[PDB]
């Protein structure tokens, strides 16, 4: 069946526990692929809106186009090594 | 079938010709390469060099091996990449996004109707396509709600 | 005419 | 159920061939039946062994989970842990596929000692395949350099006129450089007490020590891809090694450097890989540009193919060092596509033309389409595949590698697009000459491509087109494994 | 009239390789 | 006229003005096969084609834009 | 209907390519013609359904690329722009295929020729019907592949072999930039789909849009043979005339124009690129016309005419008049193909198969049917009022002055001179071939006859389309307010009013006066005062004639300087780097170092009591010496090795 992500954060585990570390790496990766799936769905709305609107695509799809360009810089796979090996608070 | 007497007949005809460079019903079983003694083996080889000397690019000994072992193996590889129940990570993430759509908006009657009639094979075909299906509300809810929990896993900020 | 003969049957 | 079965079956296979062929060596002055028809019954057994090796990995492929993160099929054997993930699975399949192809290439073009050649080829295929499924640096290095001993003897025995020089080049270039990689491995075992893949990926070393470790590892990798200016050994080896040796070297060995970057640099030296990325791009871009221009002045037919592999693997190095999924996937796709097209070009040059005329000089050949139409069809088709024309897997790999490079570095990564023009310059100039003008006055009319050579070309062309048209067969397996190699902190 | 293309050396010494005047075979 | 060495040179495209003796029989076998593929393409094309400007009502697009805001 | 239109030409290529041996020469040619005709009829049905009923067709075969956010599918769309490009492509391809049946009847390799010819048609169909840039790139590359196999069709001829290579490598130069533009498109927008990229044009940075479309512009120049990447165009004349007829009318030569028109939503927001396109098209129009007036090969003159006309489309694009460029593109595909077909009819009619117009003369009475096709096509090319070219070309020249900017005014003169030259070399070509005194031997004229009906039939169909086609289709593309949302024109860039009304009445007839009046002056000089054109007397005229006859010396500059130096860089890299310093720092250098060192060590090993005794006693100094002197000892030891 559809197995779900084992939500686990690098900030609530001990890296000496190899199983907990493995789950944190997997959980972060699976959340990043959901963002890509969301980005593709939002782009599908932009494609459908552009075709049906015709010369009205600037007005009819203004909010959709703005949303796509804001999500694009960060709705991509970023990996887990960056956050696992770095502490933003410090 | 070794057919020792066949080599005796063949060798006599070769021996009958003192000159060189101037049969079809012949084969060998697997036991001929290991169980034959020295006396019988040497007769076959002497004939083979002379018979080959009396003479395109066929019957080289690889056809049966490749077309029975290699080509069906490639078919199996083709079958695996075609008809295997493999859920890639991007395919899993699409189903998870729609599952989280249900689990967050269980009070929306319209949303449940489209999801129930959205078949599994058509789950990954959201958007404009040849399939006549109702998914406008499915897209609308996604456009309004962030169903990813990436901020939840990042409990430390600058 | 050129009357190019037909080749062997294929 | 993988490494244990693969090693034991092949060791039994090696023993079986040795017992049969060497039984009557006792100054018997014998004739025997196994040696009839150029040791046909001994070549056939070795060919069957290569086919069975493919089935071994297929059984484990059925149980492979593309939605599972981490290594699968974890196994303990010879005090070594073995595992498979998405990237390892595809590279193993490519290595085992080239097994029968390499053997079939030298079916009836060797002067003798077919049994020795068959055992050496199968030994090399297994050793290289095992190098993709080892789970520590020490085991990686053991299999990385174990292939030198069978390959050194193979080139020196079955090689061309300059086989002696080629044997020295491959043995010394690939060992003196790998020893610098061993130093970095030894450092890991000293300060961490382990060289396990998972264990060393979670450890952050000092920025100065990571610089020293990266340089030691990259020297062994850069010589093996190869990259300029440590590439001069490769053209000599290809121009003198036997056709089966060239197929394995061009199709598998050069891909170990790209896989080495995946295992030894990206997940364990992530911080220093980001810093070294501009330097790697500069070296690889110059490697791509210089090799293409140098290829324009070569006169040896097999040397031209050897330099073409250098330019393509420069794109692979550029793509694999991009810090995004597009570049990483494209580099892996291009490696698989290069694993089929590159051997085919050697087969066309060093296996079809050479086996008939025995001269590799370019001046002797022109207008070959007049009496060798079947040869020219494959030569033209594989020439367009080698140049990155769409519908071929090379285009998918090159476009994504170039796109990933631009995403990683928009300014200097844009220079990777020169591969589209430069690759067509030297590859088509060779193909245009070999097919254009009147038939060569220095050649006698002879047989066209035979059935055996048709089989080799067709089954190397088929995977290239399938990957080119529908690369999702490859991308689906790679997506989860490749996403782990990205290092970024977006806030 | 005719002239040699650019980058064609006037002299060379490659050991015992014969030394001949550079000729453009296109102009023959 | 000339000599083309057709005894062994047999390219897929003919080799210097080649027409087999049974060219009429093969031509019919090709025309029927060619006709059987155009009809198959037509049926696949009709059943797979769609109008991208009619898959969503304009009212549906308005809801998408408002939610995306 | 969409699937039948696109992949039917591919079936003909496969049938002739692999089954042409088993069906013979004649059946192979007609089956290929049958496959193209099926695409012709299906295209016309779609043209009514798309243009007139405002319907679109989309077929999605399967996914191609699924690398994270980059999703590319094997999808084909037929919108107004695609079906507008399909009509010139498939119709001319069928007429060229019908033309090729009788023109190639004496060729030993007709089956392969039709296999390549139909493959080119399929590649071009994929180019204009793909719904994303990557599907466009698939057709973009195979267009060069098929053209390479067509230009070098007679591979036994050295010139054809090298000419095909020249076309391929120059087009690959554009492909390299085209790949770079697509990569930047993924970098900025994360997609190559038309429906995605065109919806973000107004919100993207102008610098980002410029870089993408500069790469598109470089790729367009290679295919369209604009200035700097036009040498291969005349080398394409080595292939058979049906290739040239198809290539230069509704094919690869026009691919560059389509790419810019497709990218119109992006192109409107980077006016600097439009300024470059306007000048590049204007310069190419002036240069091409001047060269064509001192050229002698009949096909070279028409090829230069194609380059001059394509530039007229470019200047229309440069002023954001994408509708003008498309309409002139459709009309040009009809009468320019007629010129090549009729030019090839003259070459076949003469027994010697001469192609130099200096060896022609007095063909008008002997081949009147070919002359009328040339005469009607020439007038249509010269924008004679009432014909197709007049309604498509004259408006573009007017649009340059109607732009009312400095660049538009300069290009107007370049276009005006281009129009004047267009009439000048058409009269010059006609006079030498049909009206001049005979130059060929008398034996040629007593065997000079018109060709068969099969060759004639496509020419008559094109001739009628070269008279009435432009008048009927003017309102579709040039009508004010006509909905063509596929081509986007910004409100600030609509100059169809100031071009139509504000023009002085003199400019409306100035190209006509310079064309017909200038042509009459040239005709009078040729007939009665030909001693003027004996230019070998005057030294300045000889240089001026030679300079334009050698095509602005660009071919000499390209080969003797650019290509030679690029090959010498490889030679320098091979000699000084690959075989040079990397061998000094390699096997050769280390061998000399090893030989020198090992020779010294060989002399140190000999049985001698005094020798070994001194070394043992010398080692006692290491104990005595303070260790800080070890490096000085190390330097001393190396000094003795020397
Ligand atoms: C039947 C009796 C055979 C011996 C049984 C045995 O206990 O040997 C140990 C091993 C069987 O496996 P096991 O005991 O379950 O533990 C894994 C260790 N390999 O069996 C073995 O380990 C035998 C392995 C022999 C083959 C090893 C040769 C190495 C090949 C070159 C190295 C290449 C890779 C580096
Ligand atoms: C066969 C062909 C193969 C390919 C041939 C070579 C082409 C590829 C390499 C050429 C460069 C491709 C395009 C890269 C430039 C695109 C970026 C750009 O838009 O340029 C402007 C941009 C500055 O943007 P801006 O907003 O002004 O910065 C403000 C900072 N506060 O950024 C810049 O400042 C521009 C960066 C400097 C320009 C670099 C280009 C020179 C590269 C030379 C390569 C060697 C020759
Ligand atoms: C010379 C050597 C021999 C090589 C020559 C032959 C090369 C053939 C290359 C074919 C490569 C395999 C591609 C087809 C494999 C099937 C793809 C697939 O998995 O299905 C995807 C698509 C919908 O996906 P899904 O819903 O997941 O269905 C999976 C059900 N198990 O399901 C589908 O819609 C299936 C569609 C099948 C299409 C048939 C193939 C048509 C021809 C290729 C189309 C590519 C586009 C046209 C390219 C021409 C250039 C423009
Ligand atoms: C050498 C030959 C080796 C062949 C190996 C490759 C076999 C390809 C696997 C075929 C799988 C079966 C198949 O085609 O899928 C069924 C599919 C219709 O089902 P559906 O999923 O609804 O597709 C709708 C897509 N929107 O059907 C399709 O979607 C196919 C649509 C294809 C698009 C038009 C065809 C493009 C190619 C034209 C030439 C092929 C047609 C002529 C066939 C004879 C010549 C090959
Ligand atoms: C082919 C080579 C590979 C691609 C190289 C791309 C180079 C084009 C880059 C154009 C660009 O960077 O746009 C900015 C350009 C010059 O920059 P600037 O005028 O100083 O500042 C403008 C800030 N809005 O501003 C301009 O648009 C005017 C100058 C454009 C020069 C075009 C020639
Ligand atoms: C990026 C790779 C391109 C690197 C450009 C290097 C340019 C260069 O070094 O050219 C040197 C060459 C002059 O050297 P050379 O002709 O040998 O001078 C002695 C003649 N008797 O000059 C040339 O060969 C012309 C090179 C011009 C193109 C640069
Ligand atoms: C995976 C673990 C494998 C390890 C063991 C492999 C077998 C070793 C050889 C023993 C049998 C033997 O020497 O037999 C010789 C065999 C058979 O050749 P042949 O043509 O019949 O011999 C000639 C006799 N004639 C002419 C009468 C027919 O050839 C070989 O040498 C092949 C195997 C060795 C290849 C690599 C050599 C260098 C190894 C270096 C390791 C780091
Ligand atoms: C860090 C990356 C390292 C990459 C590899 C380093 C260079 C390898 C050279 C190959 C030599 C070879 O093949 O040895 C064989 C060559 C034979 O020479 P030949 O080709 O027959 O021509 C020369 C013969 N003549 C003139 C008769 C035609 O003998 C040598 O040269 C002997 C010395 C080799 C020492 C190599 C030690 C390297 C130390 C580690 C690096 C500092
Ligand atoms: C999307 C891509 C689809 C491609 C399918 C098209 C049909 C294929 C037909 C093959 C048969 C053929 O034409 O090649 C073979 C023909 C045979 O010569 P012939 O004309 O029979 O005369 C024979 C007279 N000789 C013997 C003097 C030639 O020419 C040749 O030897 C040309 C050599 C290069 C062939 C290039 C093949 C096409 C490359 C395509 C790159 C993708
Ligand atoms: C109405 C239906 C329409 C569609 C028709 C489809 C026909 C399919 C072909 C059947 C004939 C055949 O496979 O030909 C096979 C041909 C013919 O030579 P051969 O068979 O080896 O004979 C010669 C050998 N001898 C003498 C021993 C007998 O081999 C080739 O060299 C084919 C090389 C591949 C060329 C195409 C590459 C394309 C790459 C890109 C793909 C997109
Ligand atoms: C080689 C010589 C080619 C012709 C030289 C043109 C000289 C000139 O004056 O051209 C000036 C032109 C015009 O633009 P502008 O006048 O600078 O600004 C005015 C801007 N409008 C026109 C929008 C109002 O721009 C160029 O240069 C064009 C780009 C170079 C093309 C090559
Ligand atoms: C538009 C402005 C007028 C241009 C046309 C003038 C007529 C013409 O160019 O012709 C006049 C002459 C010669 O006559 P020809 O046309 O070459 O034919 C006769 C062919 N001979 C010469 C072999 C017999 O040509 C020239 O050497 C003019 C200069 C060449 C470039 C054209 C103008 C460049 C400025």
UniProtKB/TrEMBL annotation, chain A:
Q: What are the EC numbers?
A: 1.6.5.3
The main enzyme category here is: oxidoreductase
Instruction: Print the keywords alphabetically.
Output: Electron transport, Membrane, Mitochondrion, Mitochondrion inner membrane, Oxidoreductase, Respiratory chain, Transport, Ubiquinone
Residue spans crossing the bilayer: none
Q: List the membrane topology term(s).
A: Peripheral membrane protein
InterPro entries per the UniProt record, alphabetical? NDUFB10
Show the GO cellular component annotation of the record: mitochondrial inner membrane
User: Where, subcellularly, is it found?
Assistant: Mitochondrion inner membrane
Q: Which GO terms describe its molecular function?
A: oxidoreductase activity
Q: Which PANTHER family match?
A: NADH DEHYDROGENASE [UBIQUINONE] 1 BETA SUBCOMPLEX SUBUNIT 10, NADH-UBIQUINONE OXIDOREDUCTASE PDSW SUBUNIT
Protein name (Swiss-Prot/TrEMBL): NIDM (PDSW) subunit of mitochondrial NADH:ubiquinone oxidoreductase (Complex I)
Q: Which organism is it from?
A: Komagataella pastoris (Yeast)
Automatic annotation (TrEMBL), chain B:
What domain of life does the native source organism fall in? Eukaryota
EC number(s) from the headed UniProt entry: 1.6.5.3
Q: What keywords sit in the KW lines?
A: Membrane, Oxidoreductase, Transmembrane, Transmembrane helix, Ubiquinone
Q: Where are the transmembrane segments?
A: 65-83
Q: What enzyme class is recorded for this protein?
A: oxidoreductase
A GO MF label:
oxidoreductase activity
What is the protein named? NESM (ESSS) subunit of mitochondrial NADH:ubiquinone oxidoreductase (Complex I)
**What species is this protein from?**
Komagataella pastoris (Yeast)
Q: What lineage does UniProt assign to this protein's organism?
A: Eukaryota, Fungi, Dikarya, Ascomycota, Saccharomycotina
TrEMBL record, chain F:
Report the enzyme's class at the first EC level: oxidoreductase
Indicate what this protein is called per its UniProt record.
NUUM subunit of mitochondrial NADH:ubiquinone oxidoreductase (Complex I)
Taxonomic superkingdom: Eukaryota
An MF annotation (GO) of this entry = oxidoreductase activity
EC numbers for this chain: 1.6.5.3
Keywords from UniProt, A to Z, are: Oxidoreductase, Ubiquinone
UniProtKB/TrEMBL annotation, chain G:
> Boundaries of each NADH:quinone oxidoreductase/Mrp antiporter transmembrane domain copy?
132-411
One Gene Ontology cellular component annotation? mitochondrial inner membrane
GO molecular function annotations of the record: NADH dehydrogenase (ubiquinone) activity; NADH dehydrogenase activity
Where is the major localization of this protein? mitochondrion
GO-annotated biological processes: ATP synthesis coupled electron transport; electron transport coupled proton transport
> What compartments host this protein?
Mitochondrion inner membrane
- Classify the source by domain of life: Eukaryota
EC number of the protein: 7.1.1.2
Q: Specify the protein's topology with respect to the membrane.
A: Multi-pass membrane protein
Function per UniProt? Core subunit of the mitochondrial membrane respiratory chain NADH dehydrogenase (Complex I) that is believed to belong to the minimal assembly required for catalysis. Complex I functions in the transfer of electrons from NADH to the respiratory chain. The immediate electron acceptor for the enzyme is believed to be ubiquinone.
Q: What is this protein called?
A: NADH-ubiquinone oxidoreductase chain 5
Organism lineage reads as: Eukaryota, Fungi, Dikarya, Ascomycota, Saccharomycotina
Gene encoding this polypeptide?
Answer: nu5M
């Amino acid at each position: 069946d559809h197995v779900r992500s084992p939500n686990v954060s690098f900030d609530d585990i001990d890296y000496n526990n190899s199983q907990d570390l493995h789950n944190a790496q997997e959980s972060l990766l699976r959340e990043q692929w959901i963002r890509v799936s969301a980005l593709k769905v939002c782009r599908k709305a932009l494609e459908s809106c552009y075709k049906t609107s015709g010369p009205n695509h600037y007005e009819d799809c203004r909010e959709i186009a703005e949303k796509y360009l804001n999500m694009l810089p960060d709705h991509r796979i970023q990996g887990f090594l960056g956050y696992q090996k770095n502490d933003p608070s410090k | 079938a070794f057919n020792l007497q066949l080599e005796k007949e063949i060798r006599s005809k070769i021996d009958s010709l003192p000159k060189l460079n101037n049969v079809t019903n012949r084969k060998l079983s697997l036991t001929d390469y290991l169980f034959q003694n020295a006396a019988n083996q040497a007769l076959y080889v002497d004939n083979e060099a002379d018979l080959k000397e009396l003479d395109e690019n066929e019957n080289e000994g690889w056809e049966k091996i490749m077309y029975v072992g290699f080509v069906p193996t490639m078919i199996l590889i083709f079958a695996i990449v075609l008809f295997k129940d493999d859920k890639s990570i991007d395919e899993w993430a699409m189903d998870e996004l729609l599952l989280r759509l249900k689990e967050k908006n269980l009070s929306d009657v319209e949303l449940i109707d489209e999801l129930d009639k959205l078949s599994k094979s058509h789950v990954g075909k959201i958007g404009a396509s040849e399939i006549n299906k109702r998914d406008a509300v499915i897209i609308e809810r996604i456009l309004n709600g962030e169903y990813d929990q990436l901020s939840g896993l990042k409990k430390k900020e600058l | 005419d050129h009357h190019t003969p037909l080749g062997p049957a294929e | 159920m993988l490494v244990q079965n693969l090693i034991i079956f092949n060791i039994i296979g090696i023993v079986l061939l040795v017992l049969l062929n060497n039984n009557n060596n006792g100054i018997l002055n014998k004739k025997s039946l196994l040696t009839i028809k150029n040791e046909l019954k001994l070549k056939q057994i070795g060919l069957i062994i290569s086919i069975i090796n493919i089935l071994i990995i297929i059984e484990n492929w059925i149980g492979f989970n593309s939605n599972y993160y981490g290594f699968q099929n974890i196994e303990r054997f010879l005090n070594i842990y073995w595992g498979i993930d998405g990237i390892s699975l595809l590279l193993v399949l490519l290595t085992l596929i080239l097994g029968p192809i390499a053997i079939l290439s030298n079916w009836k073009n060797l002067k003798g000692y077919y049994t020795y050649y068959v055992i050496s080829i199968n030994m090399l295929v297994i050793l290289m395949a095992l190098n993709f499924i080892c789970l520590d640096l020490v085991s990686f290095y053991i299999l990385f350099e174990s292939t030198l001993a069978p390959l050194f003897l193979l080139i020196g025995i079955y090689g061309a006129n300059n086989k002696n020089k080629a044997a020295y080049y491959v043995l010394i270039y690939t060992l003196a450089s790998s020893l610098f990689m061993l130093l970095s491995i030894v450092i890991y075992y000293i300060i961490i007490n382990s060289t396990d893949y998972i264990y060393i990926n979670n450890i952050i070393l000092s920025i100065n020590l990571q610089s020293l470790l990266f340089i030691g590892i990259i020297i062994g990798i850069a010589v093996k891809t190869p990259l300029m200016p440590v590439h001069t050994w490769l053209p000599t080896v290809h121009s003198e090694s036997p056709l089966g040796g060239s197929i394995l070297l061009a199709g598998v060995i050069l891909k170990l450097a790209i896989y080495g970057v995946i295992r030894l640099l990206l997940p364990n030296l992530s911080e220093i890989s980001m810093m070294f990325t501009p330097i790697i791009y500069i070296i690889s871009i110059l490697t791509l540009i210089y090799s293409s221009l140098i290829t324009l002045k070569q006169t040896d037919l097999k040397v031209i193919i050897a330099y073409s592999s250098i330019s393509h693997l420069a794109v692979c190095m550029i793509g694999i060092f991009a810090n995004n999924l597009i570049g990483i996937n494209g580099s892996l796709i291009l490696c698989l596509a290069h694993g089929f097209v590159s051997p085919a070009l050697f087969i066309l040059v060093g296996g079809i033309l050479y086996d008939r005329y025995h001269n590799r000089l370019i001046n002797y050949y022109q207008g070959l389409s007049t009496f060798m139409p079947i040869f020219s069809i494959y030569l033209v088709v594989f020439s367009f595949c080698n140049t990155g024309t769409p519908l071929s897997g090379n285009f998918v790999g090159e476009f994504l590698s170039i796109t990933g490079a631009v995403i990683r570095h928009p300014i200097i990564g844009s220079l990777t697009a020169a591969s589209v023009l430069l690759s067509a310059c030297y590859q088509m100039k060779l193909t245009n000459r070999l097919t254009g003008s009147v038939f060569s006055q220095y050649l006698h009319i002879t047989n066209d491509v035979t059935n055996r050579e048709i089989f080799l070309l067709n089954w190397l062309l088929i995977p290239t087109i399938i990957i080119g048209i529908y690369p999702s067969f490859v991308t689906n397996i790679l997506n989860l494994a490749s996403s782990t190699l990205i290092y970024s902190v977006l806030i | 009239k005719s002239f040699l293309p650019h980058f064609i050396p006037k002299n060379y010494s490659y050991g015992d390789y014969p030394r001949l005047k550079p000729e453009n075979l296109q102009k023959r | 006229h000339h000599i083309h060495t057709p005894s062994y040179i047999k390219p897929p495209t003919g080799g210097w003005n080649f027409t087999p003796a049974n060219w009429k029989q093969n031509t019919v076998l090709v025309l029927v096969g060619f006709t059987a593929c155009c009809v198959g393409l037509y049926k696949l094309g009709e059943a797979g084609s769609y109008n991208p400007k009619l898959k969503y009502k304009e009212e549906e697009l308005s809801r998408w834009n408002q939610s995306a805001k | 209907m969409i699937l039948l239109c696109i992949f039917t030409p591919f079936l003909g290529s496969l049938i002739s390519g692999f089954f042409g041996r088993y069906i013979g020469v004649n059946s192979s040619k007609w089956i290929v013609c049958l496959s193209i005709f099926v695409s012709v009829v299906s295209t016309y049905i779609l043209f009514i359904d798309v243009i007139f009923n405002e319907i679109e067709y989309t077929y999605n075969i399967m996914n191609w690329l699924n690398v994270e956010y980059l999703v590319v599918d094997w999808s084909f769309t037929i919108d107004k722009l695609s079906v507008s490009m399909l009509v010139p492509v498939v119709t001319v391809s069928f007429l060229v295929h019908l033309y090729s049946v009788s023109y190639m009847s004496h060729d030993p390799h007709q089956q392969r020729f039709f296999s390549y010819l139909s493959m080119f048609t399929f590649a071009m169909i994929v180019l204009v019907t793909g719904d994303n840039y990557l599907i466009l790139f698939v057709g973009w590359e195979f267009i060069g592949v098929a053209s390479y196999l067509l230009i070098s069709f007679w591979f036994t001829r050295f010139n054809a072999v090298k000419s095909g290579l020249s076309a391929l490598l120059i087009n690959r130069f554009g492909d390299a930039l085209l790949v770079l533009g697509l990569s930047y498109l993924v970098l900025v927008t994360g997609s190559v789909n038309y429906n995605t990229v065109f919806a973000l044009g107004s919100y993207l940075d102008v610098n980002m849009i410029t870089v993408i479309l500069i790469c598109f512009l470089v790729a367009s120049m290679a295919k369209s043979a604009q200035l700097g990447l036009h040498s291969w165009l005349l080398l394409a004349m080595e292939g058979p005339t049906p290739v040239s007829s198809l290539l230069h009318a509704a094919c690869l030569v026009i691919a560059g124009v389509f790419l810019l028109m497709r990218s119109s939503p992006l192109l409107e927001y980077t006016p600097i690129v439009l300024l470059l396109i306007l000048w590049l098209g204007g310069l190419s129009t002036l240069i091409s016309g001047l060269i064509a007036m001192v050229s002698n090969d009949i096909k070279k003159i028409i090829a230069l005419s194609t380059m001059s006309q394509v530039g007229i489309m470019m200047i229309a694009i440069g002023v954001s008049c994408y509708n003008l460029a498309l309409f002139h593109l459709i009309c040009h595909s009809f009468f320019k193909a007629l010129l090549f077909m009729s030019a090839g009819s003259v070459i076949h009619s003469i027994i010697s198969e001469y192609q130099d117009i200096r060896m022609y003369g007095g063909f008008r009475q002997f081949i009147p049917l070919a002359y009328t096709c040339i005469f009607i096509a020439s007038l249509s090319l010269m924008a004679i009022p009432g014909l197709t070219g007049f309604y498509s070309k004259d408006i573009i020249i007017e649009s340059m002055y109607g732009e009312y900017t400095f660049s538009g005014f300069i290009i107007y003169w370049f276009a005006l001179i281009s129009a004047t030259c267009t009439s000048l070399y058409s009269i010059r070509l006609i006079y030498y071939t049909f009206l001049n005194n005979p130059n060929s031997p008398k034996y040629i004229y007593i065997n000079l006859k018109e060709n068969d009906i099969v060759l004639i039939t496509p020419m008559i169909i094109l001739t009628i389309l070269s008279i009435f086609g432009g008048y009927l289709l003017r309102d579709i593309y040039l009508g004010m307010g006509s909905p063509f949302n596929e081509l986007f024109i910004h409100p600030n860039n609509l100059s169809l009013i100031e071009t139509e009304f504000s023009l002085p009445s003199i400019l409306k007839v100035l190209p006509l006066i310079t064309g017909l009046g200038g042509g009459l002056i040239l005709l009078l000089i040729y007939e009665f005062n030909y001693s003027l054109f004996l230019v070998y007397n005057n030294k300045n005229l000889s240089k001026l004639y030679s300079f334009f006859n050698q095509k602005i010396m660009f071919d000499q500059l390209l080969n003797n300087l650019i290509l030679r130096s690029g090959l010498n860089i490889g030679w320098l890299l091979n000699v000084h780097i690959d075989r040079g310093i990397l061998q000094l720092f390699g096997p050769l250098g280390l061998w000399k170092l090893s030989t020198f060192i090992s020779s010294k060590l060989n002399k140190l090993v000999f049985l001698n009591i005094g020798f070994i005794l001194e070394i043992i006693v010398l080692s006692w100094l290491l104990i005595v010496f303070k260790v800080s002197l070890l490096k000085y000892i190390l330097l001393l030891i190396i000094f003795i090795i020397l």
